[PDB]
Design an enzyme around this catalytic site. Structure first.
Site, PDB file in Angstrom:
ATOM      1  N   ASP A 103       0.797  -1.224   0.000  1.00  0.00           N
ATOM      2  CA  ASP A 103       0.000   0.000   0.000  1.00  0.00           C
ATOM      3  C   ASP A 103       0.832   1.278   0.000  1.00  0.00           C
ATOM      4  O   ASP A 103       1.240   1.768   1.046  1.00  0.00           O
ATOM      5  CB  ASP A 103      -0.931   0.019   1.209  1.00  0.00           C
ATOM      6  N   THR A 104       1.025   1.825  -1.234  1.00  0.00           N
ATOM      7  CA  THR A 104       1.850   3.020  -1.326  1.00  0.00           C
ATOM      8  C   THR A 104       1.185   4.245  -0.714  1.00  0.00           C
ATOM      9  O   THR A 104       1.867   5.237  -0.452  1.00  0.00           O
ATOM     10  CB  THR A 104       2.210   3.317  -2.799  1.00  0.00           C
ATOM     11  N   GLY A 105      -0.119   4.216  -0.506  1.00  0.00           N
ATOM     12  CA  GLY A 105      -0.846   5.315   0.131  1.00  0.00           C
ATOM     13  C   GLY A 105      -0.832   5.292   1.626  1.00  0.00           C
ATOM     14  O   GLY A 105      -1.412   6.198   2.259  1.00  0.00           O
TER      15      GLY A 105
HETATM   16  C1  LIG Z   1     -12.826   1.590  -3.053  1.00  0.00           C
HETATM   17  O1  LIG Z   1     -11.847   2.615  -3.215  1.00  0.00           O
HETATM   18  C2  LIG Z   1     -11.211   2.889  -2.055  1.00  0.00           C
HETATM   19  C3  LIG Z   1     -11.530   2.319  -0.828  1.00  0.00           C
HETATM   20  C4  LIG Z   1     -10.768   2.648   0.288  1.00  0.00           C
HETATM   21  C5  LIG Z   1      -9.701   3.509   0.184  1.00  0.00           C
HETATM   22  S1  LIG Z   1      -8.755   3.957   1.587  1.00  0.00           S
HETATM   23  O2  LIG Z   1      -8.265   5.353   1.444  1.00  0.00           O
HETATM   24  O3  LIG Z   1      -9.470   3.620   2.826  1.00  0.00           O
HETATM   25  N1  LIG Z   1      -7.426   2.997   1.554  1.00  0.00           N
HETATM   26  C6  LIG Z   1      -7.672   1.590   1.531  1.00  0.00           C
HETATM   27  C7  LIG Z   1      -6.747   0.800   2.461  1.00  0.00           C
HETATM   28  C8  LIG Z   1      -6.897   1.274   3.885  1.00  0.00           C
HETATM   29  C9  LIG Z   1      -7.116  -0.685   2.436  1.00  0.00           C
HETATM   30  C10 LIG Z   1      -6.295   3.479   0.792  1.00  0.00           C
HETATM   31  C11 LIG Z   1      -5.085   3.706   1.695  1.00  0.00           C
HETATM   32  O4  LIG Z   1      -3.937   3.691   0.860  1.00  0.00           O
HETATM   33  C12 LIG Z   1      -5.186   4.978   2.526  1.00  0.00           C
HETATM   34  C13 LIG Z   1      -5.101   6.278   1.731  1.00  0.00           C
HETATM   35  C14 LIG Z   1      -5.314   7.501   2.609  1.00  0.00           C
HETATM   36  C15 LIG Z   1      -4.282   8.399   2.811  1.00  0.00           C
HETATM   37  C16 LIG Z   1      -4.516   9.469   3.654  1.00  0.00           C
HETATM   38  C17 LIG Z   1      -5.711   9.631   4.355  1.00  0.00           C
HETATM   39  C18 LIG Z   1      -6.737   8.739   4.086  1.00  0.00           C
HETATM   40  C19 LIG Z   1      -6.533   7.683   3.241  1.00  0.00           C
HETATM   41  N2  LIG Z   1      -4.172   5.054   3.552  1.00  0.00           N
HETATM   42  C20 LIG Z   1      -4.305   4.896   4.864  1.00  0.00           C
HETATM   43  O5  LIG Z   1      -5.356   4.598   5.461  1.00  0.00           O
HETATM   44  O6  LIG Z   1      -3.112   5.029   5.496  1.00  0.00           O
HETATM   45  C21 LIG Z   1      -3.161   5.030   6.918  1.00  0.00           C
HETATM   46  C22 LIG Z   1      -2.000   4.142   7.391  1.00  0.00           C
HETATM   47  O7  LIG Z   1      -0.811   4.953   7.334  1.00  0.00           O
HETATM   48  C23 LIG Z   1      -1.192   6.343   7.358  1.00  0.00           C
HETATM   49  O8  LIG Z   1      -0.840   7.013   6.137  1.00  0.00           O
HETATM   50  C24 LIG Z   1      -1.935   7.774   5.631  1.00  0.00           C
HETATM   51  O9  LIG Z   1      -1.648   9.180   5.652  1.00  0.00           O
HETATM   52  C25 LIG Z   1      -1.845   9.550   7.024  1.00  0.00           C
HETATM   53  C26 LIG Z   1      -3.181   8.904   7.342  1.00  0.00           C
HETATM   54  C27 LIG Z   1      -3.095   7.577   6.608  1.00  0.00           C
HETATM   55  C28 LIG Z   1      -2.703   6.397   7.480  1.00  0.00           C
HETATM   56  C29 LIG Z   1      -9.457   4.125  -1.007  1.00  0.00           C
HETATM   57  C30 LIG Z   1     -10.195   3.836  -2.140  1.00  0.00           C
END
Ligand SMILES: COc1ccc(S(=O)(=O)N(CC(C)C)C[C@@H](O)[C@H](Cc2ccccc2)NC(=O)O[C@H]2CO[C@H]3O[C@@H]4OCC[C@@H]4[C@H]32)cc1
Ligand SMILES: [Cl-]
Lengths: 99, 99
Positions: free
Chosen positions: B25-27
């Site tokens: 998970d690059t996000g």
């Molecule tokens: C069906 O389509 C979708 C369904 C769900 C999602 S999501 O955003 O919930 N997510 C899915 C994943 C949890 C299974 C994408 C993730 O890449 C999100 C993407 C994301 C980034 C920022 C904020 C919200 C979401 N990242 C995230 O929750 O990261 C957490 C963990 O580390 C921290 O880094 C991030 O940055 C700090 C907070 C988060 C914390 C996106 C599109």
């Protein structure tokens, strides 16, 4: 390009003639953008992540440029904490993960 | 390997003597795993996402094997709906996004 992950993989996108910043997110099935206006009709979608679900507006066949690469596809708009480019558009720009 | 994004980039990990499936998970800044026991001290943390925040336990210096590649770093444990390998460990296995 080759994007390392020491920093957040933030790129510039262009949607609606406007430049925005977004995260390339391999953990996202779908592309979700912060509140903005887009043309056409929308359909409802509920999407889920860490912390729960949100309601978003689904817009289909939207022209979007991602780091200079042209895509046309589905964009979800709603109360996301971050603009995220998910796999539906990462595949259009030919992105892969490599190690 | 080269992993395309047509489907979720899921891999097998070994953590705390257990096998789990996790998303590359690059996000995600941080690595977040469902409830399990890990050794050593921990500290509480709140982490956000779509839907809000969850409370997790932060464990440092945890060794993880990700699709055969070993890495050490911080692991957050708590009620995540998905096991996620975030950038803190993706860097250590040499993962890049390429397009
Ligand atoms: C069906 O389509 C979708 C369904 C769900 C999602 S999501 O955003 O919930 N997510 C899915 C994943 C949890 C299974 C994408 C993730 O890449 C999100 C993407 C994301 C980034 C920022 C904020 C919200 C979401 N990242 C995230 O929750 O990261 C957490 C963990 O580390 C921290 O880094 C991030 O940055 C700090 C907070 C988060 C914390 C996106 C599109
Ligand atoms: Cl290999």
């Amino acid at each position: 390009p080759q994007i390392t992950l020491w920093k957040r993989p933030l790129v510039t996108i262009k949607i609606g003639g406007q430049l925005k910043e977004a995260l390339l997110d391999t953990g996202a099935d779908d592309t979700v953008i912060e509140e903005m206006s887009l043309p056409g009709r929308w359909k409802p979608k509920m999407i889920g992540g860490i912390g729960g679900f949100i309601k978003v507006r689904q817009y289909d066949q939207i022209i979007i440029e991602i780091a200079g690469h042209k895509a046309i596809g589905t964009v979800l708009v709603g109360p996301t904490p971050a603009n995220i480019i998910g796999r539906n558009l990462l595949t259009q720009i030919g992105a892969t993960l490599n190690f």
